[PDB]
Amino acid sequence: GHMADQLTEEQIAEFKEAFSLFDKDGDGTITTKELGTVMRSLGQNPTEAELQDMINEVDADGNGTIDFPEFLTMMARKMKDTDSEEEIREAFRVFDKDGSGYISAAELRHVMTNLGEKLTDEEVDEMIREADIDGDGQVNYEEFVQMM
């Protein structure tokens, strides 16, 4: 069988109830009105245009609303995304061996060396310099997030 079918109908019904947090009239799609409702419940207040722009960047079939599949797709990407931030933070820590919040040439020297590379001091210092944005001689976490 398939793991997806390893639930009960009452359980799928219950899973579907959770969608109603956003899909308040229960019809199976989120409208701009419903999403505006949710936003305003969080203290925000966007326009019809802004609400239609949020919806559009998740609206896979083009019909102007968010069904439960699109929502779950959107959520899964979000969940994988926050994990990718956890691990860029993890990676910053590995480079920043002294936990000072800033990566030195020395610290980048070290990691590069332990990763195989055989670059010069200049080439490594050419990295810190190319990566710096506040000219402080070190690489804070944000200049590090610029590792695209």
Q: CB neighbours (10 Å) of residue 125?
A: 15
Q: How far is the CB of 83 from Ca ion (least distance, A)?
A: 25
Q: Which stretch binds Ca ion (CB under 5 A): 10-18, 49-57, 91-99, 121-129?
A: 91-99
Q: Does 142 bind Ca ion (CB under 5 A)?
A: no
CB-based contact 139:108 (threshold 8 Å): yes
What phi and psi values does residue 19 have, to the nearest 5 degrees? -55, -30
Q: Does 136 bind Ca ion (CB under 5 A)?
A: yes
**Distance (Å, whole) CA 6 – CA 20:** 23
Token pair belonging to 132: 């710096």
Comparison of 78 and 129: residue with beta carbon closer to Ca ion: 129
Q: Which stretch binds Ca ion (CB under 5 A): 2-10, 47-55, 60-68, 84-92?
A: 60-68
- Mask for 25-54, x = binds Ca ion (CB under 5 A): x-x---------------------------
Instruction: Report how many helices (DSSP H) and strands (DSSP E) the chain contains, helices first.
Output: 7, 2
Side chain identity at residue 107, one-letter code: E
Q: How far is the CB of 120 from Ca ion (least distance, A)?
A: 21
Cα-only R_g, the chain: 23
Q: Does 14 bind Ca ion (CB under 5 A)?
A: no
Q: Which residues bind Ca ion (CB under 5 A)?
A: 23, 25, 27, 59, 61, 63, 96, 98, 100, 102, 132, 134, 136, 140
